[PDB]
Symmetry: C4
Subunit: 221 residues, 4 copies
């Protein structure tokens, strides 16, 4: 009977149908946002969603028997699996965080549809030749986040009171958002040489970013 199901799963119909449900589920997730829609089609959608998750679980089971070990060595299948699994965890209990993670299922449209797979794949394959720089950077933040914490945390708890608060603030400085009016001008009211810390940090972190980008451009060419 193995081959009987394999010619179902491997069919065009099967894929087209799933892709069809992804888009339907996606559309319905956005309608589930409208307070108006939910007082009308309230029960309608509550059932429609328990229906779709069933079809998807069936799909992932069928896909598993047709593929066995190959299934759990496909990044895309694993994504489909974990995403369907999250959706399976009961609507209540623990925190509601899981209920929100459901909408990550709509990334199945990247899985189920080729060409989408293609771009995601092209985008991701660029990451490996970055990890040496990403590591350098992370070490860099960590060194500066520790300095910032012990230089500015006492008088500026909100922004630098904690290693993590300093990571957060430095990230903001890196994105250059309000770094002068919001952070360094206030800081200099107490610590007039604070600029000696932040101008260099901005130069280095900016410089590295520019190189990181150059990398990706020259290497693709």
């Amino acid at each position: 009977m193995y081959l009987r199901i394999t010619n179902i799963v491997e069919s065009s119909f099967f894929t087209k149908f799933i892709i069809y449900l992804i888009v339907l589920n996606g559309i319905t997730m956005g309608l589930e946002t409208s307070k108006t829609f939910m007082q009308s089609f309230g029960v309608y959608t509550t059932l429609f969603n328990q229906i779709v998750i069933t079809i998807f679980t069936i799909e992932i089971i069928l896909r598993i028997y047709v593929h066995r070990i190959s299934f759990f060595k496909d990044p895309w299948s694993l994504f489909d699996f974990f995403v369907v699994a999250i959706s399976l965890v009961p609507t209540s209990s623990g925190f509601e965080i899981l209920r929100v993670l459901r909408v990550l299922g709509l990334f199945r449209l990247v899985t189920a549809v080729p060409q989408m797979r293609k771009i995601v794949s092209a985008l991701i394959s660029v990451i490996p030749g970055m990890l040496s720089v990403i590591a350098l950077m992370t070490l860099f933040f960590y060194i500066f986040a520790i300095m910032a914490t012990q230089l500015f945390g006492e008088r500026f708890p909100e922004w630098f009171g904690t290693l993590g608060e300093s990571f957060y603030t430095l990230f903001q400085v890196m994105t250059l958002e309000s770094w002068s009016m919001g952070i360094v001008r206030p800081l200099m009211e107490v610590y007039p040489y604070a600029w000696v810390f932040f101008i260099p940090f901005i130069f280095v972190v900016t410089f590295v970013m520019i190189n990181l980008v150059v990398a990706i451009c020259v290497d693709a060419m």
Copy 2:
């Protein structure tokens, strides 16, 4: 009589004269801005504009007989047509929006003048090899917009209360404008882990943008 008009329309004079009116109309559209100018040359300009639109309709009609079906398969002509048409719709009625859309007529100067066409044409030809990434991105926003709405909309109606309000805010976050001081720092006063939603969102949306640009550079070569 066909050829009699065709040697008019196709002449050097004809185009030079239209290009002349474009610039004349354009200049006059900026003077129609001055509150001072309109209390003086008020009626003067009101007539000058009704004249120009006539010459332009004549122009588009003459251009149609000389070109027939070819006219309506030329992007530039279609633009010229639709732009003259918007201008034809009566000054009153409906909304005043149309009255504003008239100034889009000055993009004719891109049509009537070569070299302008050339650049616009080059800029546009880059769009096709982007639609997959633009598509990816749009899906991405949509997934994150739906999550933000159900995670932050209750306590932050202005920014996340609505799927579209969430779209707008996320776009702003993408441009990185006030994203920490204006949005995430306030958000964290209620949801201390909000950063888990926005730092990743920023990385992904930035990363993709950086690639989107790389694309255009290497591919142009």
Copy 3:
């Protein structure tokens, strides 16, 4: 006697001496900033500056006789000439604007020193292959500045009340500084669809900028 001066002007000494004065003048311009310095070396510097301008005028005269027509066909000499001329206009009269323009003389260090000339020259030579895009852009701002003025000027005079105010505000939007929190969120309190005007404007103006940069990168390669 022509050759007598030509072997002065064309000497290394001559150039080295002028470059020496540029740097001295430059240093002294920054000291002329200190309120402390000016109550001490007040008269000292007032004379030192009238001295330097004399030596420079002599220099530009000597350079002219050794070069005649070639002098006024050298961009660099013309700069040196006009910059020395501005410095010659009496300290008083008209407005003080001229007194400030003096410090532009320190760009003589770009003239008098090669290698500096080289970079300025490389940087400028990139401009010609941009004017078609710069023109497109300027037309673009002009069309949108006029729309913004007649759409938002009434209720938002400070930002959009004038064609120029609209140019200014749109430039700010283009640099993406406070565009949402500072301009478009306030605007939407009155005009809820204002986003239909600014999101497109941001896309187009951003898109063009990215291409403008691609241009310069691919063309150099």
Copy 4:
């Protein structure tokens, strides 16, 4: 006895052990941040750090005898030396700044570990072909900083009252952070033409930055 130590220092063990201490020291420097941790493991950590600095000084001494003059002509060793030296300066006296500079020791992890060296080395090698543009820029800031001081310092002491205050503000304008809402819009309330100073400054400083980046991309190829 020379070779006896040389086969220690040059061993795989030696480096692995140092790299181990770097990471151990590094981790412990972040725990020294927790107010909680220090009331518990207070004395524990105070000793652990005096131990590590000893091992590191021994390390740098052993490395010196095995390398002598070659040691002091290796950038990385010089760094390791100066970084260990800063750490040697007593916890008290002068300012506490030195105590903070200790954490710069964690950049050793870049030294002791290859591949890190590799990236840092690649990033740095790009700097030489920039110094002409960095030089141009610095001259540029200096010229505009002096002008801003004498044009805006009187009525705007905080932002332009001082050559250095002007440098800082102009850098902020260069990063484009709050430049219109925070600086030029306020400035124009007194000096309606201030925009003539800042829009050009922004164009030039942006233009140069765009070229600076182009440089690194084409030249890397």
